[PDB]
């Protein structure tokens, strides 16, 4: 007549590492490291992303005509650029403080694209039809959808000065560009005054531009270039443009709303009808476990990224059958 | 282990015991059987659930132009340092927690054995492998008396004394 003490054993092959021992077979364990993704771009807390397709941020904002136009009002949970978006700054030049603008839009949840200066009533006695082959659409030479090339009309470039007052209750992002012809002769034939000047003012922004004429190596077969500038007109403030040449006037601007939890990712995954709390450039994640070795770039409530291949916590016993 | 029971003086586990982490095997006249110890198993499940829970809840994209290399490298240093710290912390925590959990199970089953032994006294002999051979007849009621912690030593004291001689 005997009685015995013992402990549970089963057929589990789960193994966990300890300090003193490595391949320890245990009766039960729980995994803490998520390593699986669905390979899809999915909605985030019920909101679809904003996909730019062939355009990057610069091409979309400036209005590169090669990119399928987006609806006038859009709202997203995160922005997706694709790795090699062919369309961007199509007429050569530098996008001044571009990275800061990317960072700004990293917290934007909304845009309304609205006409700020209509083509036919904002710049009288100037020609609004300038195009170029550097930004071609449908084979023929074109120009940005959100800007307007102001040229001389009938041999004269009168001094223009226009204004906008922000009555949208939100920040309005305004972009424009300044042209730099390669030779003086072009500046003459385009704006008629060699010493032209542009001035853009708000209550907290202030800049004055003067065309810098110099022969430059031709990029997209353009020896002259075109700088692009931007600003955030606060609610109630006024933006003032004054010029006598070289100004690439704004036509469409954006009324922005600010949100939480968004960002910009580069991904060549495709949008599916799905929903997650955690998006990575490779796919969605279940945000249930504390760690993930999928991608350091995450958007949403997401496990902490680590380099480990295995994080497994034993709950059962040492399996000795 | 650290407490000598699991993989120690109790060489292996019991796949026949499907009802608990720790427990008993008996063989008397009326037959044999396994029987989990539900209170110790439930307390261990409580503790380990708490451990898993607190580990689960202890844890709760920029660009740069050509002339901002220093800031790019500082951002990368920050990201890499945080990554190093968190990988280190996760792996360390898991290792130490696994060690402590295995030792917890070892301690629980050794405690079980000692409770039975100090209940039984010289009314039985330790025959190794975590088993006691009774010096008296112990029916299913006596086995449950050992399990529930209510073993009556003077009830069988004299009979076990006689057979122990």
């Amino acid at each position: 007549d005997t009685i015995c003490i013992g402990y549970h054993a089963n057929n589990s092959t789960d193994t966990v590492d300890t300090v003193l021992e490595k391949n320890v077979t245990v009766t039960h364990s729980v995994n803490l490291l998520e390593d699986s993704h669905n390979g899809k771009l999915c909605r985030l807390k019920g909101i679809a992303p904003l996909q730019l397709g062939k355009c990057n941020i610069a091409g979309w904002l400036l209005g590169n005509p090669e990119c399928d136009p987006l609806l006038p009002v859009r709202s997203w949970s995160y922005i997706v650029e694709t790795p090699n978006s062919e369309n961007g700054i199509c007429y050569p030049g530098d996008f001044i403080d571009y990275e800061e603008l990317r960072e700004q839009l990293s917290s934007v949840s909304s845009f309304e694209r609205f006409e700020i200066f209509p083509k036919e009533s904002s710049w009288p006695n100037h020609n609004t039809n300038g195009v170029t082959a550097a930004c071609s659409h449908e084979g023929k030479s074109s120009f940005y959808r959100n800007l307007l090339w102001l040229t001389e009309k009938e041999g004269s470039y009168p001094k223009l000065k226009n204004s906008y007052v922000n009555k949208k209750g939100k920040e309005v992002l305004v972009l424009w560009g300044i042209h730099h012809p390669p030779n003086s002769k072009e500046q003459q034939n385009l704006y008629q005054n060699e010493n032209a000047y542009v001035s853009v003012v708000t209550s907290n922004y202030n800049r004055r531009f003067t065309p810098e004429i110099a022969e430059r190596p031709k990029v997209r077969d353009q020896a002259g270039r075109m700088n692009y500038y931007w600003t955030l007109l606060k609610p109630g403030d006024t933006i003032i443009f004054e010029a006598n040449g070289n100004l690439i006037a704004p036509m469409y601007a954006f009324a922005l709303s600010r949100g939480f939890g968004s960002g910009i990712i580069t991904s060549n995954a495709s949008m599916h009808e799905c929903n997650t709390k955690c998006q990575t450039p490779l796919g969605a994640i279940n945000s249930s476990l504390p760690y993930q070795n999928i991608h350091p770039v995450t958007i949403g409530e997401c496990p902490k990224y680590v380099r480990s291949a295995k994080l497994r916590m034993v709950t059962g016993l040492r399996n000795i059958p | 282990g650290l407490f000598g029971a699991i993989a120690g003086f109790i060489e292996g586990g019991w796949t026949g015991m499907i009802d608990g982490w720790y427990g008993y095997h008996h063989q008397n006249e009326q037959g044999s059987g396994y029987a989990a110890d539900q209170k110790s198993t439930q307390n261990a499940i409580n503790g380990i659930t708490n451990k898993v829970n607190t580990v689960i809840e202890k844890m709760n994209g920029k660009e740069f132009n050509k002339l901002e290399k220093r800031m790019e490298n500082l951002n990368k240093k920050v990201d890499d340092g945080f990554l190093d710290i968190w990988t280190y912390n996760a792996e360390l925590l898991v290792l130490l927690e696994n060690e402590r959990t295995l030792d917890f199970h070892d301690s629980n089953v050794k405690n079980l054995y000692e409770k039975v032994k100090s209940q039984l006294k010289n009314n039985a002999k330790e025959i190794g492998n975590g088993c006691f051979e009774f010096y008296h007849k112990c029916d299913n009621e006596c086995m449950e008396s050992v399990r529930n912690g209510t073993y009556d030593y003077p009830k069988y004291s004299e009979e076990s004394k006689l057979n122990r001689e």
């Binding site: 709950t315 059962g316 | 499907i18 009802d19 608990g20 539900q38 659930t49």
Partner: peptide, 13 residues
């Protein structure tokens, strides 16, 4: 039959 919300003991009573 234990109160095991996380399945720590894999069912088991």
């Amino acid at each position: 039959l234990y109160e095991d919300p996380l399945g720590v003991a894999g069912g088991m009573g």
